Each structure stands twice: as structure tokens, then as C-alpha cells.
Amino acid sequence: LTTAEYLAYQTERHVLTILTDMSSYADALREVSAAREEVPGRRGYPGYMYTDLSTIYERAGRVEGRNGSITQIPILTMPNDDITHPIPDLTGYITEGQIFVDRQLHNKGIYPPINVLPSLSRLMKSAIGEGMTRKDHGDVSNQLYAKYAIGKDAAAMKAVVGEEALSIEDKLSLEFLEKFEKTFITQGAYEDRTVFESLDQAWSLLRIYPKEMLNRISPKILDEFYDR
Amino acid sequence: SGNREQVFPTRMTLGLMKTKLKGANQGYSLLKRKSEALTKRFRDITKRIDDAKQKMGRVMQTAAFSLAEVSYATGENIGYQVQESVSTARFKVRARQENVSGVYLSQFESYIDPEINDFRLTGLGRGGQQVQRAKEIYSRAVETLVELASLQTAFIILDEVIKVTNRRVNAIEHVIIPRTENTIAYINSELDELDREEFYRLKKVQEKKQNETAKLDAEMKLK
Amino acid sequence: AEKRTLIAVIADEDTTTGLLLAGIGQITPETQEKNFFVYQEGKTTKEEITDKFNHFTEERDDIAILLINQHIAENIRARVDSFTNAFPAILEIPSKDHPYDPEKDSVLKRVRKLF
Amino acid sequence: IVAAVSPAGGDFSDPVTTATLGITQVFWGLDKKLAQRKHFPSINTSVSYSKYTNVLNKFYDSNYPEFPVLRDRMKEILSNAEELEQVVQLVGKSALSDSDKITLDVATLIKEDFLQQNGYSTYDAFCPIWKTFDMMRAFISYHDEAQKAVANGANWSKLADSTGDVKHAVSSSKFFEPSRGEKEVHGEFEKLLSTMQERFAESTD
Amino acid sequence: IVAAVSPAGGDFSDPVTTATLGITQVFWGLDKKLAQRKHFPSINTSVSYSKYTNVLNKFYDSNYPEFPVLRDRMKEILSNAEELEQVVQLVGKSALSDSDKITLDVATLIKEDFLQQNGYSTYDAFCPIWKTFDMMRAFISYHDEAQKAVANGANWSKLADSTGDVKHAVSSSKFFEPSRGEKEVHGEFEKLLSTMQERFAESTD
Amino acid sequence: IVAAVSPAGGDFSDPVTTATLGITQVFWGLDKKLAQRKHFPSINTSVSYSKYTNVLNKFYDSNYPEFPVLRDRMKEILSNAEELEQVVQLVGKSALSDSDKITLDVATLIKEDFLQQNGYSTYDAFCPIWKTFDMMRAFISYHDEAQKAVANGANWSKLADSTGDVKHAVSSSKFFEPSRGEKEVHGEFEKLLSTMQERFAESTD
């Protein structure tokens, strides 16, 4: 983070700092805390866990005057796959969202195993619009999330009410979920997809549905992006 | 406070019961949506059976007057002749088999007997027309009976599924939730508190020992 | 279960049997018993009708529909008792000689109650 | 290293296992349910992992080219069927589609005949890599044949009844004594897979 | 002190949020679901209690005498509709009585045009207390006239279709400009109520 | 030494209780849920135990020879009631057989009339051992006669109202004043047993 602050403020270049496995950093912070003979706080981590996590995370963000900007993507391992653990909890309590990697999708062979349904970016709407990325990006995101949720619950119901008793929306949603998880989320390890190209794939995926079933997307965007 | 589950509080138990709560919650939602699907089908069956009842008014009256016209042609009630006419008239009810909304509702698909008109050909010419009208009314009757069989079997299934979802949301989920509430919030927090008390007592003992070592030295150093 | 055929026994009106046996009927040549027992149009006590209903809907293994004349509004309790299952006999209440399909029909009563 | 970790009462909440998980590239975690069923070995095929799946591709591409694809297919079948089982145990198997029934049944076949391994009998005491690869191929191709056949008309109950012989063949393929050598064991598996394909082609019509 | 509480994981059970809920008299209770439906200000009226309603009678009776009973009526009809949505889910809409359908329609009008405030337009960015009170009178009078003219008159649907203009007027009552002056706005609301009364009198025939 | 253990929070796992257990041969674990509904003496039959039943058999065979058999029968039907209630609170009384219904009814009778004891009224302040044994015979005989009548053909739903006088006599058998003397009370109990047997024989004709 000191190098990032240098490169981003004393020079001008942006920077996307990555902090791999902050859970191991918390593990090391436990050793420092116990070295000082401090009593353990919750879960064994020191009570000031939040302070020394914040003093890392909050060293990022754009700055008035200086053109640079530090973007953090602090990766961290779920200790036992529970949000309630102090480290994921505190990080989600300081950071601007979360981007899950899900065991369930990884066992299917998907890569990356990003779980879209719980993952969210709180201030995504700032980075989306006409000026940056295409103008349909926000509504494409909204509709993709909605149809993915429909696909997930309808995949749950395929085993309950049978495939034939699902409404045509849910049948199209199963087809969309299969193609989604297998072609859109599923990305080659070395496949660089430009955000415009990824939106083009998203559109090639959403045009499964008729224009009327894409209720989430504004009509002014459908009338110029659905057909191409 | 509330319905305990009388479980032994430990971290493996908290995780197990949290997964069990997740399973029961998704099961409640899943069975609730199965129940809405089945009750949609059930309401369709109820409206069709009411329509078939008012058909058993009107169309049955029409077929009865077909019989009445045949009797008028014959000049007398042919019912006595029709009595004990044949052992198996030209109609039968095949074994029901179907699967509606995930439930094997048994709708009877009755079909005409291959030995058609086993009791026809009696009296004047209106007998055949009355037989055909009776066969049409009997097809309507097979339809109404199939709708009623659905409105009974799916009624039982919808009652069982609805009471299972209600039992879940009332007893099962609302007893699993207090079980985890106990296991973590009361007991695990209490045990961590005890352990932190023990550690603080250790820290106090260690600090007083080092301090007195500090005062015995630093006093040998003072003089 | 196995295939079977309908029957109509409710003492209100047996003319429905005359109007229906032209197309659909049932007798047991092996048992020498007319499965489509007449209703006598009120010429018999309800005990015989109840016995025949018990034989058809609780002793016969072959499953099919069954019909009942305006007496279905009279024997509603027994109809509710025997209507616990769609088999062996899913009852029905045709109008017979008079318009007699009101809200008093047992199946219609159950539908309205669950409505 | 092969560092056994006694799991104690807990499953993974024990801090030794949690601290180990951040270090070991491979973690064959225990499965309590498979142990209570006496299903040996009883490793959990849903929470275990090997960060060595991708580095080994340099070795797979030279000897067993289809091994990674088959492993991914096997994992996909097992995971989809565990999802499906988590529902059917709560509702029942009546509503399952034919493809769902195949996924569930092939998962049971896998979990009983591929994943399971006695480890004490003269056969299957040490399942060499080529025999394991050939059984992966046999099971995956059996699932593929079933899915493709029910993609056509053939309903799956009659198909299972008619190809019970093929199912038993792929199930008992584990019995192939590995001391016979790859030269002839691979021939046995080729014969098995060919008869499998021809039987499914026959029963499709 | 309007002090927000944002617990660690949205648990709303940790001692800080329990203490604040115990001490803070009014808890306006925002909701995520009401925000996703774009129903700003996203107040969840089910849980958003307020224990300052009682001490404010000394202010209401001074210069808005009917306000307390008026909000009690609005809250009770809103809660009745919230309860009756469950009955609509259980059994078809037709099974509801005429009075129940009146309650549902009026509370939908409430949720759409009284609670739901644009906040960005110039007409309802600032809803003064007098305009809020007059809108409350209009809405509650609408429910009362519908309720009375149905309990002593024709079916709810016939009146609703016959007096859809009145419902549109009370819905568009949100658009009256607060900048127009308190006296002018109050006179306009009185005009709306008078036209209301005469229109319900006409449609009663 | 009889010593109440008064655990904090009502938790049986409270360390003073756990230490007290393992050294006390008897454990009359009271339950707060029963004491809330004024069901005295509020003992919890599910978890209470007494390691002294094995050594008391000598006294019982010397004085009340069939006391232990009756105790075993009573605890058996109580446990059957507990499992049946666990089933019913999730399924409902419909799925219950007829013997299950009679077990539930007799166990409710016991829990309201035998196990319960007002502790302050003149009739149940001190229930001497002979009256307790007599009521065990009365309640178990009622259960046996009802079970036999159900087995012999009479459905319990019809039997309930026909023999309701006998069930009420059993319920009111706890009002037999202990000071009336062993001869008087035992004569009354023999009368109750004879009336039970004759009425249950008559009602099953």
C-alpha cells in the first residue's frame, strides 16, 4: 500500500493493488498480538483486528487534485466458509462489497467460480454509464442478475414440479442458466474479455428471451441493442 | 425461552445445525412453491368440476330428452326393455394414469367397449340416436369423474404439502433457529468469555510476578 | 387397480339408468348381478341402497365411476363417508328426472367449502 | 509430505485443520456420512481439493490426454447429483426428469464403484493410473450414452431394465486384476466400452 | 439525535442495535426490499414504530385536531391490507368481501401515492405538515365514502369504475405545489373534498 | 440428602447440576414449561430417573407386589405418548391409529390426574403410598380395558363418550381424601375397579 500510494499520488498513474489471502495476514497479526502478551479478542484474533484491517483498506480511493487512484481487491480465504467469521465480516464491514468465489461452482469445473447471486459491488453504478463502458451496461447487469436468480430457483423446482410443469419463462431460464454458467461465467484462464466484448456476450445470451420478457431492461435500450 | 432442541452446544454442532437450518429453510420455500403450483392446478380443477356440474345439469337434460324423444317415438318408456339388456354395454373405464404438476393424479381415460351396441337395435329408429347421445353424455361423465378424482387426490396432496410447509415454518424452523441461537449466542459466547477470564487471570499473575521481579531487581540496582 | 364400469343407485329416480344404459352400463355376468342396479324411483328403503353402495364402493375391487340421482342430496352424509377416495367408486350426482344439482351436492359441497 | 490430521470431535473448526488448509495444496478431507455408511475410502468429494490439478496437465497431455476432461465431468456429475439429492431426499424421486434420474443414478454408480475402493482385496488394492483412467472413461461414457439415449425417445426405466447387463459390466469393471498389465486390461476396457456403445445403440431403437 | 444503526452483518441482534432500539423512541425502519421495488422513501410501515405519537397530541389538538385519529385510521387500514394480502395469496381475490376489496384498493392507493414520495420533483420534495394532513383527510375520506356507499349500497367494482375520476383526483393530489401558499392549497383540498362528496352522492344513486 | 440444585437459566448443563449429577442416585429434574401451566409438582418424566428402583423391589414384593410392573407400564405409555405427540405436532391426529389415540388419551389422563398433584388441597397434600398404588392400578386398568375394547372391535371415538363417566371417575379418583383411612379408600378403589370392568364389558357388547 505504501508503494501504491507512491505510484498513485506522488506520481499520477492509477493502480489496482491486490492483497492475496488477507486471512493469512490476520493469522500473522494474531501472532504479533500474542507476542505482546495481549489477551485474545473474539475468535482468537486481537480485538483491534478492525483497526489494523481498516488502516490497510482505507488507504485507497481517488483523491482531489492528484489524478491517480488506488483500487484494492483484497482477496481473502473464508476460514470455514462462513460470513460470520471475524475476518470476512470485518472486511465486508470496511470494504465496498464482495465478490464471492463459490465452492459449488468450482466443483462443477467452472472457471472462474464467481458466484454472482451474493456478489455485489456497492458503488458499481458510478463506474457504469455512457461515459465509461456502454450505456446498456447497468441494465444488462440488472437483467442478468434477475434472470440468473430465476434460473437458480427454477432449477431447484425442476426436481419438484417436473420439467414440463414449469412456465415458459422458467424453461427459457433453465436454458439461459446453462448457457450462462457454461459460456459467460466460464472463462478461459488466459482469455482476456474486454468489457465491451463481455457485454456483447451478455447480449448474445439475453436474446434467448423475447423482448417482452426482458422487463428489467429499459425499452429505450432494448429497441437498439436487442437486435444486431 | 422458546422451544429448545436439547442439543449439546459445540462448534461442530453450531455448524451442523446452521446447515440444518439452511436445509429446512430451503425446504420450506421449495415446498411452499410446490404448494402454490399444486393449488393453482387444484383451483383449475375446481372451476372445471363446477362447469362439469352445470353441464350435468344442462347437457344431461338434453340427453334425457333424447331418451324422452326416443320413448315418444316408441310410444312408451323403453326403460323396462333396456333393463338387464346386456352384461357390458358399449363403454368402459380404462385404468387412470397421469402425472400433473409432479403428482400422479389418476384421471380416468374411459373408452368405448370394442363390442359396440351390445344392447342397441331395439324398437324404432330413435334408439340408435339415443344410444349415441348417451355415449356422448357418458364421455362427459368420464370427464367429470376424472376431474373429481383429480380434485380428491390433488386435494389430499395439497393438504399434506400445505401442512408440511406450515409445520416447517411454525415448529421446525422456529425450533432450529432457537437451537442455533442458544448454541452460539448463549453458550459459545459464554465459554469464550470464561476462557478470556482465565487468560486475563494468567496475565495478571504473570504481570505481578514480573513486576515484583522488577521491584526486587531495580532495587538491588537502586542500592 | 383394474378397469370397471359405472353404476347408478339413488332412490330418487331410476329413469337416469334408462337414459344412460343406452350408451354406458354395467352388469356382472360372472356374478349374475346387474352392476347397474336400479334405484326403484323411491320404491325401496334406504337400507338396500346403502347395502348396494357398500358392496360396489367397498367390496368391488375393480374401480370405476358411479352415478346417483336426486337422492344424493338426501344421503349426503353417507356420500361424504364413502367419498374418502376416488376409488373404487368416485361418486357423481346427475340431475335424473328433475333438475337436482344444487349447491347441496356432496362433491359440490366440498368444492365450495374448500373454495 | 502426507500429513494426516486427526479431525477430533469437530469437522474443520479445529484450528489445526484451519491453519493447515491455508498451506497444503491437496486436502483429502474426511466425510462423516461416508464413514457411517462404511464407504471406504471415506473422503469427502465436495470439500476436498487439489491445487495440483492444473500443473499436472503437462503430465496428462502426454500420457492420458482425456484425463482432465473426464475428471471435470466426474466432478460435475457428482456435484449436480448432490444438489439433486439434497432435494429428492426432501421431496421424492417421482417428479425427477429422465436426465435428472440419470444424473442421480450415475452418481450412485460412481460413488459405489469408482470412488469406493476396498483397498484390501488382491484386485483394487492399488488401482494404477491407467486402470483408473479407463474406469473414468467407462463411467463417463455410460452417463453420456444414457443422457444421449434419453435425449431421444427412450424413457429411462425401460432403458435401465434393458441395459442392466451393461450397468453391471461397468460396475464390475473394478474387479479387473491390475496385475494383468495395461496391455490386456486396456483391451478389456476397450471391449467393455465398445459393447456398451453397441448395446445403447441397439436399445435406443 | 437521528442515529443510524448498521450492525455487523445485518443481524439486528447485537447489543448496540438492541440498546438503540430500546432507547430511541422512534425507529423509522428503512427496508431493502422496499428500495429494490423503487418505493422511496423505503419506509417499512410494518415495524417502524414511533412512541412520540402520544406526546404530540398537545401539538395536534392545537392546530391539526383530526390528525391523530386520522393516522390511526390510515395505519389500521394499511395493516388490514397487509394482513389480507396473505388471504389473497391463500384463496382467490374474489373470495374477499366488498369491504375487504375496498381496503385493499385504498391501501394500494396509499402505498402508491401517499407513502411513495418522489422527493426529487419540485411538487413533493418537501411535503409540509398542512399538505400532508390535507392529503391524509382526502385519502381517509375516500376510504370512508367507499366503505359507507358499499356497506349501504352497490358492489365495490361498480362504484370504483364509476368514481375512478375521484380516485385519480386524490392520487394527483400529491402534485399540489406547496409553494402555492398554505391558504390556497387548503382551499384547493377543500374543493377536492367537496367535489368528492358530490361525486360519491351522484354515484350512490 | 434431598437437595434442590436450582441451575442458572434453567439449563441442565449448568456446572453445579452436572457435578451434582453422577453422585446423586435420584434426579427429579423439574421442567419450567410444566410449572408455567400450574402442572404440579412439575417433574419432567422424560429425563428424570431414580437408580433406586432396582433395590426397592424387595420392599415392593413384600408390600405392593405389582407396583413395579405398574410403574413400568405407566412409564412405557408415557414414553409412547411423548413420541406420539412428537409425531402429531407435525402430522396431526388424522394419521394416528386407534391404539395410538387411546395411548394419547390415557397419557393425557395420567398427566392431568395422576402425575399432577395440587400439593396444597386437603385431598392431595399427602398422597399415601397405598392410595398412589391404587390409582396406578385404576389408571392402568382403564388403559388396559380401553385398549382391549378397541382391539375387540369397538372404535375408541364412539367409546369415548359412552364411557366418559368411567374416565371422569378415574379423574376424580384423586379426590379420595387420604385421611378417610386405608380401608375406606381401598374399598372405594375396588368399587371403582369393579365399575370400570363392568362398564367396559357392557359398552363393548
Can you spell out the DSSP letters for D29-75?
-B-HHHHHTT-SS-B-TTT-EETTTTTTHHHHHHH-TTHHHHHHHHH
Specify burial of residue B163 (Cβ count, 10 A radius: 0-12, 13-18, 19+).
middle
Coil, strand, or helix at residue A218? Answer: coil
Nearest-CA neighbor of C3 among B117, B89, B111? Answer: B111
Residue B172: name the closest of B164, B161, B181, B183 by CA: B164
Q: Per the structure block, which three cell numbers stand in for E135?
A: 392529503
Q: Residue A39 burial by CB count (10 A; 0-12/13-18/19+): exposed, middle or buried?
A: middle
Considering the domain B11-213, what is its CATH architecture? Answer: Orthogonal Bundle (1.10)
Task: Name the CA dihedral angle for B14, B19, B22, B28, rounded to a multiple of 10 degrees.
Answer: -110
Cell numbers found for residue F113: 390426574
* Burial class (CB within 10 angstroms; exposed 0-12, middle 13-18, buried 19+) of B10: middle
d(CA B149, CA B152) in angstroms, rounded, equals 5
**Beta strand pairing call for F26-27 and A15-19:** unpaired
Is the distance from CB of A160 to CB of B30 less than 8 angstroms?
A: yes
D40 marked among binding-site residues: yes
Measured between CA atoms, how close is D118 to chain A, in angstroms? 25
3-state helix, strand, coil in chain A (%, to 5): 50, 10, 45
**Which residues face D83 on adjacent strands?**
none
Q: Any CB–CB contact under 8 A between B12 and chain D? A: yes
Looking at residue A39, the DSSP 8-state letter turns out to be P
Helices D98-113 and D67-88, interaxial angle, to 10°? Answer: 110
Do at least 3 CB pairs under 8 Å connect A with C? no
Buried-exposed string E84-116: b where 16+ CB fall within 10 A, e elsewhere: beeeeeeeeeeebebebbbbbbbbebbbebbbb
Residue with cell 379426590: F175
Q: B-chain residues within 8 Å CB-CB of A40? A: 196, 199
Residue E186, C-beta contacts closer than 8 angstroms, at least 6 positions apart: E130, E134
* Chain E interface, best mutation among A93, A122, A218, by max E CB count within 10 A: A93
Peptide bond into D41 cis (omega under 30): yes
Distance from CA of C94 to the nearest CA of B (A): 6
Tracing cell 401442512 back to the chain, one arrives at B163
Determine the 3-state secondary structure of F176 from DSSP.
coil
Taking the C-alpha atoms of residue A77 and residue A22, their distance in angstroms, rounded to an integer, is 7
Question: What is the distance between the alpha carbons of residues B179 and B3, in angstroms, rounded to a whole number?
Answer: 8
How many angstroms from the chain centroid is the CA of residue F18?
A: 28
**How big is chain D, counted in residues?**
205
Q: Using a CB-CB distance cutoff of 8 angstroms, which residues of chain A are in contact with residue E9?
A: 83-84, 89, 92
Subunit contact B151:C111, Cβ cutoff 8 A: yes
Contact B92, B112 (CB under 8 A): yes
- Quote the domain boundaries for residue F190: 51-205
Look at phi and psi of residue C4 and say left if phi exceeds 0, alpha if psi is from -120 to 50, else beta. Answer: beta
Neighbours of chain A (3+ CB pairs under 8 A): B, D, E
Residues of A within an 8 Å Cβ radius of B: 37, 39-40, 42, 80, 82, 153, 156-157, 160-162, 165
Q: CB atoms < 10 A from the CB of B34, how many?
A: 24
Of the candidates C25, C86, C101, which has its C-beta nearest B57's C-beta? C101
CA-based nearest distance D11→chain B, Å: 6
Rg of the Cα atoms in chain C: 13
Of B15, B34, B103, the CB nearest to D13: B15
Nearest to B102 among A40, A153, A165 (CB): A165
Task: Give the separation between CA B20 and CA B181, rounded to whole angstroms.
Answer: 13
CB contact under 8 A, B93 and C95: no
Strand, helix or coil at A97?
strand
Nearest CA to B111 out of C7, C33, C36, C23 is that of: C23
Tell the burial category of E20 from Cβ atoms under 10 Å away from its Cβ (0-12, 13-18, 19+): middle
Rounded to an integer, what distance in angstroms lies between the CA atom of residue F190 and that of residue F186?
Answer: 6
Alpha helices in chain C (DSSP H): 15-20, 46-54, 76-82, 106-114
Q: Which residues of E touch A122 (CB under 8 A)?
A: none
* Distance of alpha carbon E143 from the chain centroid: 11
Chains that touch D (3 or more CB pairs under 8 A): A, B
Letter for the amino acid at D163? T
Using DSSP, state whether A70 is helix, strand or coil.
strand
Interchain touch C–F (≥3 Cβ pairs closer than 8 Å): no
Q: Which helix (H) or strand (E) holds A16?
A: strand A15-19
Q: Structural domain tally of chain C?
A: 1
Distances (CA, A) of B215 to A115, B203, B204, B211, E4: 60, 18, 16, 6, 50
Record the cell numbers describing residue B3, joined without a space: 422451544
Whether the CB-CB separation of D100 and A158 falls below 8 Å is answered with yes
> Taking Cα atoms as reference points, which of B174, B10, B58, B52 lies closest to residue C99?
B58
For residue C45, give its domain range: 1-115
Query: Distance between CA atoms of A42 and E8, rounded to whole angstroms?
Result: 14
∠ CA B145-B150-B156, nearest 5°, is 130
Minimal CA separation from B48 to chain C, in Å: 11
| F and D adjacent (3 or more CB pairs under 8 angstroms) | no
C43-56 burial: b if 16+ Cβ within 10 Å, else e: eeeeeebeebbeeb
Q: Is A72 helix (H, G, I), strand (E, B) or coil?
A: strand
* Helix (H), strand (E) at residue E82: helix E67-90
Q: Which residue of E has its CA nearest to A86?
A: E8
Q: Which of A15, A17, A11, A12 is nearest to A67 (CA)?
A: A12
Single-letter amino acid code for the residue at B219: E
Alpha carbon C108 to its chain centroid, in Å, reads: 15
- For strands A61-62 and A97-98, give the pairing: unpaired
Q: Where on the phi/psi map is residue D46: left (φ > 0), alpha (ψ -120 to 50), or beta? A: alpha
The contacts of residue C81 (CB under 8 Å, 6+ apart) are none
Alpha-carbon distance D67 to D13, whole Å?
34
Q: Nearest-CA distance from B161 to chain D in Å?
A: 10
Cβ neighbours for C50, distance < 8 A, ≥ 6 positions apart: C75, C78
A108 → closest Cβ in D13, D76, D100 = D76
φ, ψ for residue B145 (rounded to 5)? -65, -40
Which residues, other chains included, contact C74 with Cβ-Cβ below 8 Å and sequence gap of 6+?
C10, C12, C46
Rounded to a whole number of angstroms, the distance from the CA of A150 to the nearest CA of chain B is 13
Contact D47, A103 (CB under 8 A): yes
Task: Find residues 89-108 of chain B whose CB sits inside 8 Å of chain A.
Answer: 99-102
CA angle A171, A174, A177 (to 5 degrees): 150
B172/F contact by beta carbon, under 8 A: yes
Residues of A in contact with E8 (CB under 8 A): 89, 93
How many angstroms separate the CA atoms of D96 and A162, rounded? 6
Q: What ranges in B77-216 are assigned the alpha helix state H? A: 79-82, 126-167, 173-181, 189-216
Q: List the Cα angle F74/F80/F85 in 5-degree steps.
A: 125
Is D117 labeled as ligand-binding? yes
CB contact under 8 A, B31 and D91: yes
Instruction: Tally the residues of chain C.
Output: 115
The Cα–Cα gap between B203 and F13 comes to 29
Q: Which residues of A touch E (CB under 8 A)?
A: 83-84, 89, 92-93
Q: Which residues have CB under 8 Å from D156's CB, separation 6+? A: D98, D101, D102, D146, D150
Given a contact as 3+ CB pairs under 8 Å, which chains touch C? B
Residues whose CB is less than 8 angstroms from the CB of residue E169 and which lie 6 or more positions away in sequence, other chains included = E192, E195, E196
Tell me the three cell numbers of residue E112.
402508491
- Residue given cell 429497441 in the structure block: A223
* Residues of chain B with C-beta less than 8 angstroms from the C-beta of D94: 99, 102-104
Residue closest to D174 by CA, chosen among D88, D112, D93: D112
Residue A148 to residues A152, A179, F37: CA-CA distances in angstroms?
6, 11, 51
C-alpha cell at position C74 = 338426501
How far is Cα D175 from Cα D173, in angstroms, rounded to an integer? 5
- CATH number of the domain that residue C39 is part of: 3.40.50.10580
**Do D169 and D192 form a contact (C-beta atoms < 8 A)?**
yes
Give the number of other Cβ atoms within 10 Å of residue D203's Cβ: 17
Q: Which residues of chain B lie closer than 8 angstroms to D10, CB-CB?
A: 10-12
Rg (CA), chain E: 19
**The pairing of beta strand A69-74 with beta strand A15-19:** parallel
Residue of C nearest to B68 (CA): C19
Q: Which alpha helices (DSSP H) does A36-73 contain, by range?
A: 49-57
| Residue D112 phi, psi (nearest 5) | -95, -20
Residue A9 vs residues A1, A16, A53, F156: alpha-carbon distances, Å: 12, 13, 21, 87
Question: Cβ of F148: how many Cβ atoms within 10 Å?
Answer: 13
Find out whether the peptide bond into E41 is cis, omega within 30 degrees of 0.
yes
| Residues of chain B positioned with their CB less than 8 A from the CB of D11 | 12, 15
Cα gap D12→D14, rounded to integer Å: 5
CA nearest to D173, candidates D145, D148, D192, D199: D192
| Residue set of the binding site of E for ADP | 40, 117
φ/ψ bin of D8: left (φ > 0), alpha (ψ from -120 to 50), beta (otherwise):
left
- Tell me the CA distances in angstroms from A199 to A129, A131, A135, A138, E22, one per residue in order: 13, 15, 11, 10, 49
Can you read off the three cell numbers belonging to residue B191? 465459554
